[PDB]
Amino acid sequence: MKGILGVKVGMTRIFRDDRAVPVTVILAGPCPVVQRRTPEKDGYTAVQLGFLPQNPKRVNRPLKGHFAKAGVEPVRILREIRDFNPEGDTVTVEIFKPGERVDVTGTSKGRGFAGVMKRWNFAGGPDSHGAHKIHRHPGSIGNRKTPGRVYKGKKMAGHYGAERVTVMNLEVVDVIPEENLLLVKGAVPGPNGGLVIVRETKKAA
């Protein structure tokens, strides 16, 4: 179930078959598999997949040269791939052919305390007529004596954004192995320079 880590680089249009193709260039660098963990001593199947190299030994003792190729532990080994057993070593952009759909998981841009209406697309109040200090307010939040309380999931204002988000079934417009670049078209979450993980699609699986 091929997966790979990477950083959202940017967006741009492509042109193909005399057609504009809006895409999001993600860099899916070589991912040194550092652990596997099978139903033997884990109960499932995955692949620790350390990403960006870096670390002039800000690595301390929790380092794992245990699995040979630690090639100086990477900044974010974080996240396995679950039910993926690679070409033995080092996973790269090669796992993706132009024309495959993919599921990108990202960390959506944060908006902090966002009001109902944005958080939730509420209509708020009228900007004129009666009006009165309730223009962007949520209105009523309940009934009367029964139930005499607010529902468990009542859509209200709160922190919104900066969360796990997975835009699904994205076309792979192109892949450039020379530079570990991968071009999906459109809507990958989070900011540029944020970390994402690209996976096989779930439309087929």
Partner: protein
């Protein structure tokens, strides 16, 4: 990693240099490849360039003209594969970046407002009169 924009600046191998120099204010004629019901012709479009949206690759420019009693504005990507070519038909003295103001103005009065950049006209000619010479012998 800090390749950043120079990476995205790599995907641009659709960048395209076979195109002429023009500025908001002067009028140009851009030949564009259009489908047109199954077949395919190279329909032209001639008018004053209203704007230029500089952004490296995918910068875009807009041209406007009065087609049969109605003004029309078209927006082309400066590096679009469908632009077979584009010939400048006259230079104009902009004085100002974006020229939206000519919309509520269209008539004779847009003339004597955009008034032929001789300086840049006297080029082109002399710039093609010296490229037509130093090309043969």
């Amino acid at each position: 990693m800090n390749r950043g924009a120079l990476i995205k600046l790599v995907e641009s191998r659709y960048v395209r240099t076979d195109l002429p120099e023009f500025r908001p204010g002067d009028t140009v004629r851009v030949s564009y490849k259009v489908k047109e019901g199954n077949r395919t012709r190279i329909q032209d479009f001639e008018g004053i360039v209203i704007r230029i949206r500089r952004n490296g690759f995918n910068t875009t420019f807009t041209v406007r003209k009065v087609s049969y009693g109605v003004g029309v504005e078209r927006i082309f990507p400066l590096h679009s594969p469908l632009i077979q070519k584009i010939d400048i038909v006259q230079r104009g003295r902009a004085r100002r970046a974006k020229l939206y103001f000519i919309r509520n103005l269209s008539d004779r009065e847009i003339r004597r407002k955009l008034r032929a950049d001789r300086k840049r006209i006297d080029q082109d000619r002399a710039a093609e009169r010296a490229a037509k010479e130093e090309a043969q012998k």
